[PDB]
Amino acid sequence: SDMHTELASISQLVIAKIETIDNDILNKDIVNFIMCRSNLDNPFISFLDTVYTIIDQENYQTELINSLDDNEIIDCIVNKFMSFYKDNLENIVDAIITLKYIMNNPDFKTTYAEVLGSRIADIDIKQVIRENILQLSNDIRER
Amino acid sequence: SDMHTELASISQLVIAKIETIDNDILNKDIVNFIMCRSNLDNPFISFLDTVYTIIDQENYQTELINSLDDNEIIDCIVNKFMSFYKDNLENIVDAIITLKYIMNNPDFKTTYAEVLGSRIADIDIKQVIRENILQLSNDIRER
């Protein structure tokens, strides 16, 4: 409801600050987010967090994941992770959130935490983020 | 020894024929290769196969993999697969071969065959291949 002015305003803050941010640090903040530790100081994280919040009215993801067996998880993981090396921001964001919802599972958390850590360390998404953030903002405000 | 004239000659055939090839089919041939079914009619496969052969004098990969537990495999898989969405051909080729060596493990084969199938279906590497093949040829001839 009030999340309109919210999201647009943070977008604007993101694009303004993205370049300046070291990528290694960005990737650390992102991991942390997946692990349910949101450093809101980082605007993009703040962006993510807001978005998550909106989605978790749905809540469906949690139930979904709790059903998945291991092959399904692995498929999910590998499928989602590809977003990062491609150039669609929506799917990147979606991926990240999907990954948090996974790490909210205590079993999957234990198993796959480490690797997510390792593999996120190797992505580079600053371009995608500056280039798409404001458009994404709208796609969702309106969604 | 005679693999010099071999590899250079097939490279040349690859670049000549790559564009023409439908990507969905290419990806099918590649999967099949990972599963130890080399359609040599496809020049790139032939390329792969040759390369594999060279490497399997080493043979080390097999022993290596047989040691890996599941997290390690998963890490390997996800790490390697990223090559596909990036633009280094060497690492792509290396990845593919690494994946075959995995599918030579009967246990890992059973578990992960399906997903490799699914996920390879979504890559697109024709650009990378035309743009790099001849250079790669040399890097290896000389290696």
Residue numbers in the entry:
A (entry chain B), B (entry chain B): 18 to 160
Quote the study's own text.
VACV protein A49 prevents translocation of NF-κB to the nucleus by sequestering cellular β-TrCP, a protein required for the degradation of the inhibitor of κB. Unexpectedly, the structure showed that A49 possesses a Bcl-2-like fold despite not sharing sequence identity with known cellular or poxvirus Bcl-2 family proteins. Strikingly, despite a lack of sequence conservation with known family members, A49 adopts the Bcl-2 family protein fold comprising five α-helices wrapped around a central helix, α5 (45).
Crystallization trials of full-length VACV A49 yielded just two crystals in a single crystallization condition after 4 months of equilibration. The structure of full-length A49 closely resembles that of the truncated protein, superposing on A49 Δ12 with 0.50–0.67 Å root mean square deviation across 140 Cα atoms. In the full-length structure, residues 1–17 could not be modeled due to a lack of interpretable electron density N-terminal to residue 18. In four of the eight molecules of A49 Δ12 grown in the ammonium sulfate condition and both molecules of A49 Δ12 grown in the sodium malonate condition, a single residue (Gly) of the C-terminal purification tag is observed; in the structure of full-length A49, the final two residues (161 and 162) and the purification tag were not ordered and could not be modeled. Visual inspection of the structures of A49 Δ12 and full-length A49 showed that, in all cases, two molecules of A49 self-associate via an interaction of helices α4 and α6 (the “4-6 face”). In the structure of full-length A49 this interaction is formed by crystallographic 2-fold symmetry, whereas in the structures of A49 Δ12 the interaction is formed by pseudo-2-fold non-crystallographic symmetry. Whereas the self-association is predominantly hydrophobic in nature, in the structure of full-length A49 a symmetric salt bridge is formed at the periphery of the binding surface between the side chains of Arg136 and Asp92.
